Design a protein around this nucleic acid. Structure first.
Ligand SMILES: [Cl-]
Ligand SMILES: [Cl-]
Ligand SMILES: [Cl-]
Ligand SMILES: [Mg+2]
Ligand SMILES: [Mg+2]
Ligand code: NA
Ligand code: NA
Ligand code: NA
Length: 326
DNA sequence: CCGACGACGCATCAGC
DNA sequence: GCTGATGCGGC
DNA sequence: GTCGG
């Protein structure tokens, strides 16, 4: 955290642009600059030094100079004092409330946590669950609890069908000492890119986890993606664990490596790697890597038998998951 | 200067 | 009911 | 907001 003041300032600017300005490219620009600075191994002494990094331009260089001279950014100081901006930013912290819903609520006079509770009827299902667990979802998950959660999910999946394979991805797979949520990649031999030989493959797993009272709520659920809420069991007389967000993604079994690359992230790492793929003439999603033709149209999927195969196609040296936390 | 900026699943809505 | 656009979320 | 061409 050599440059934690700068990266915090850039992250706050990113959030302002996404949530208030609804300027998604500015949001991504600030996040990229924050990420490149976060891994820079020197204490930054000037904006000129920072501008040498890719994704830091003139405007962020000037802001870094102001921050270094004064410890503050007047632009952020004024945003912080604006009631409407501060309220919009706050409401987007609820899962299911984005920039559009947050501005609409603020325009209707709903701008605090009590305001939301009072106006529960104006919320959709996802937003209602996000409000119910607002406090819990703000908490990080210690890796020791992530290991307990992994044990439950893998064993309950095994009880449904021994041929499922469940892999915990996200920051957990990158080795993080704490996680914001639990990301589970799921495969089953009956679901490939060639055919689906069993229905309800994801449903059966979700239902088993609900039956043992691990999954407590559902935010959204389809044939291949579940987004919901779970909770570790606690012992007699012990305070309950916080409720936690859980995502489960069923991926065709023959596309596991593209899937686990996607679901390991980080999100900024994925954006950087997919952008590099484009520059190299490929496109990467969670299923395939495909070459681009002269017209720019994606061709047929290329053979992939490891995460490293994907790095090799785009001429990147392999990066272990722990070195992908951008 | 200017186009491009990763890719996509699920919920919700408009329009038919 | 469907299709397509949009919001929000995931990494 | 940044950048490659
Ligand atoms: Cl500040
Ligand atoms: Cl694959
Ligand atoms: Cl595909
Ligand atoms: Mg996660
Ligand atoms: Mg995340
Ligand atoms: Na730069
Ligand atoms: Na939100
Ligand atoms: Na997640």
């Amino acid at each position: 955290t050599l440059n934690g003041g700068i990266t915090d300032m850039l992250t706050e600017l990113a959030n302002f642009e996404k949530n208030v300005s609804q300027a998604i490219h500015k949001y991504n620009a600030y996040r990229k600059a924050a990420s490149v600075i976060a891994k820079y191994p020197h204490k930054i002494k000037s904006g000129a030094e920072a501008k040498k990094l890719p994704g830091v331009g003139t405007k962020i260089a000037e802001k870094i100079d102001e921050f270094l001279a004064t410890g503050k950014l007047r632009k952020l100081e004024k945003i912080r004092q604006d009631d409407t901006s501060s309220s919009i930013n706050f409401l987007t912290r609820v899962s299911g409330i984005g920039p559009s819903a947050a501005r609409k609520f603020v325009d209707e006079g709903i701008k605090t946590l009590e305001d939301l509770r009072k106006n529960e009827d104006k919320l959709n299902h996802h937003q209602r669950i996000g409000l119910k667990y607002f406090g819990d979802f703000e908490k990080r998950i210690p890796r020791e609890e992530m290991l307990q959660m992994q044990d439950i999910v893998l064993n309950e999946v095994k009880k449904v069908d021994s041929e499922y394979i469940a892999t915990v991805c996200g920051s957990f797979r990158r080795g993080a000492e704490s996680s914001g949520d639990m990301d589970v990649l799921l495969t089953h031999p009956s679901f490939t890119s060639e055919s689906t030989k069993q229905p309800k493959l994801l449903h059966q797993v979700v239902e088993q986890l609900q039956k043992v009272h691990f999954i407590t709520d559902t935010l959204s659920k389809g044939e291949t993606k579940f987004m919901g809420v779970c909770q570790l069991p606690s012992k007699n007389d012990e305070k309950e664990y916080p409720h936690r967000r859980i995502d489960i993604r069923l991926i065709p079994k023959d596309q596991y490596y593209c899937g686990v690359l996607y679901f390991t992230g980080s999100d900024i790492f994925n954006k950087n790697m997919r952008a590099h793929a484009l520059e190299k003439g490929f496109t990467i999603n969670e299923y395939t890597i495909r070459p681009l033709g002269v017209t720019g149209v994606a061709g047929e999927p290329l053979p992939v038998d490891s995460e490293k195969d994907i790095f090799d196609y785009i001429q990147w040296k392999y990066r272990e998951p722990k070195d992908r936390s951008e």
